[PDB]
Design a protein around this ligand. Structure first.
Ligand SMILES: Nc1ncnc2c1ncn2[C@@H]1O[C@H](COP(=O)(O)OP(=O)(O)NP(=O)(O)O)[C@@H](O)[C@H]1O
Ligand SMILES: Nc1ncnc2c1ncn2[C@@H]1O[C@H](COP(=O)(O)OP(=O)(O)NP(=O)(O)O)[C@@H](O)[C@H]1O
Lengths: 297, 297
């Protein structure tokens, strides 16, 4: 119901430079140098290839959602460039997605890091709930790493802002990641902040298992059935009953019985105060470079 | 021009407990335990004594401003309690005001800390500028320490929100700290975000001198004259010309020539990247406790 006065910055092609590829849709690492600004901002540039009115339609919708959010735990969209193919310019997250990061650094990841990430993600998600936004694609692959102590939620490709009175969202078609979906979503294509909570649970499970694939080797087709019998992801070896209990609660069939993001922040913060009691792990020129987080135009 | 939909929480006397005195106006350290919430939030309680309709008028105005701000670098007001004397309930800042903190720890304060504080304060101030709010009392004594790596701006007792079209604020009477005021303020009682910048400068100078008193031993009466001749605070021994130049620019007579908070964030962030190049310093049961920063009701 309130007016979205967010600003959409249009960037000049000549203002930034692509330094190297980060993926191939294609994403580049590069630098944005606002003319006459005297700063160099590290960025990720997502361009996309053979122009399709359908594909341009999608990225503009993602740009719209990203331009409308502003929280320390949500990815910052710097602007867009209107070249043949529209490119999204974001803040560079040096360490990549969190799923790959826990896989690559298992042996160096302590309980303090795991719990802090859980807290940060819950803060980002609580913020989106406040903005009446439903992510619909929360997963460890969609959380990025600015620094090991600072992650942010990303990928607003499925995100849906809700209407003033719209309590839930009814999708129609389209492939949504099945292993991260609430049961009400799979069966009735219904999405809510509470279904994001369910995905929060899987995401935490992915982290606690250091990057394991949920329901590994189980046809997505069967998933709906497995969850109906009452089966759920198993307790990660490093998890105390306290942590697993939280995950399980995010997987309750009754959406309203699952925890609220604001509560997940409180619980995980408490545990983050004494990490070892909750997770048991063995061994526990760039002169003018300025991070986008410090560049407020 | 936009509606301030901030929420004002009214707290029950029985919900929190005063643990000890922090000052004597009187401020106590204590714990807030929202009934049936299962959390304990460390807080500062400011009560004030012999009820005066004039004094209650003032604190409610401070409560109003504090309830309307929400930024990581601005003090969080949890709520108020309507007892004989109205008490403001804030987040406890364990380490006290920054002025006393730099005085007490001179020998342990490195360049990295100094510059990071400068950045944080500029972020808090930039945020207030966005909220069209003029602090009017920025000083090292009015910046609090949550942790040595995290400070927040406080004391909204003089703060003034501006009208949709009100470009500046014309005070009438009242004692405002002279040694931290812009020249246009002292001479014409005019205040703006740009006059807050001037006070930002003095604040940075207080930090760089580890808590020295500005214009020490100089009758406040004379100040207006000194500043007119062109005199300003001296270059702190640890400051490179780069840092001092910034301070001096905040003390330009032409308000519009002084830097903007958004710029101060950029400059100090750059310096914070290689602290030693800019400041030269020799040697460079509480189970359910939850910080207010993690308690979002
Ligand atoms: N801001 C960023 N900084 C650094 N890396 C990023 C950033 N955004 C995305 N990436 C990475 O770029 C690659 C593609 O990201 P993305 O646009 O989410 O597509 P995807 O979900 O990874 N795969 P797909 O959906 O098939 O295109 C992945 O390695 C992302 O983690
Ligand atoms: N949230 C807080 N946490 C911890 N200490 C605080 C907090 N708020 C204020 N204080 C301290 O309580 C004392 C009084 O603060 P304050 O209400 O700003 O009055 P003051 O400016 O210090 N002196 P005065 O204006 O004469 O009452 C000082 O030590 C403050 O630093």
């Amino acid at each position: 119901e309130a007016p979205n006065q967010a600003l959409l910055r249009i960037l000049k092609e000549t203002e930034f430079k692509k330094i190297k590829v980060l993926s191939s849709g294609t994403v580049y690492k590069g630098l944005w140098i606002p003319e006459g600004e005297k700063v160099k901002i590290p960025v990720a540039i997502k361009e996309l290839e053979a122009t399709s009115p359908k594909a341009n339609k999608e990225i503009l919708d993602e740009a719209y959602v990203m331009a409308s959010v502003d929280n320390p735990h949500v990815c910052r969209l710097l602007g867009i460039c209107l070249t043949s193919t529209v490119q999204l310019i974001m803040q560079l997250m040096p360490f990549g997605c969190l799923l790959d990061y826990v896989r690559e650094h298992k042996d160096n990841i302590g309980s303090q890091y795991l719990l802090n990430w859980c807290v940060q993600i819950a803060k980002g998600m609580n913020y989106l709930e406040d903005r009446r936004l439903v992510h619909r694609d929360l997963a460890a692959r969609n959380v990025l790493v600015k620094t090991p102590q600072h992650v942010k939620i990303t990928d607003f490709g499925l995100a849906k802002l809700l209407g003033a009175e719209e309590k839930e969202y009814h999708a129609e078609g389209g492939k949504v990641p099945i292993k991260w979906m609430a049961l009400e979503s799979i069966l009735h294509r219904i999405y809510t902040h509470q279904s994001d909570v369910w995905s929060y649970g899987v995401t935490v499970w992915e982290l606690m298992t250091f990057g394991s694939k949920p329901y590994d080797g189980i046809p997505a087709s069967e998933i709906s059935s497995i969850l109906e019998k009452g089966e759920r992801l198993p307790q990660p070896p490093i998890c105390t009953i306290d942590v697993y209990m939280i995950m399980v609660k995010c997987w309750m069939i009754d959406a309203d019985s699952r925890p609220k993001f604001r509560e997940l922040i409180i619980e995980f913060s408490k545990m983050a105060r004494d990490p070892q009691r909750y997770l048991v792990i063995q061994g526990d020129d760039m002169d003018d470079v300025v991070d986008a987080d410090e560049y407020l135009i």
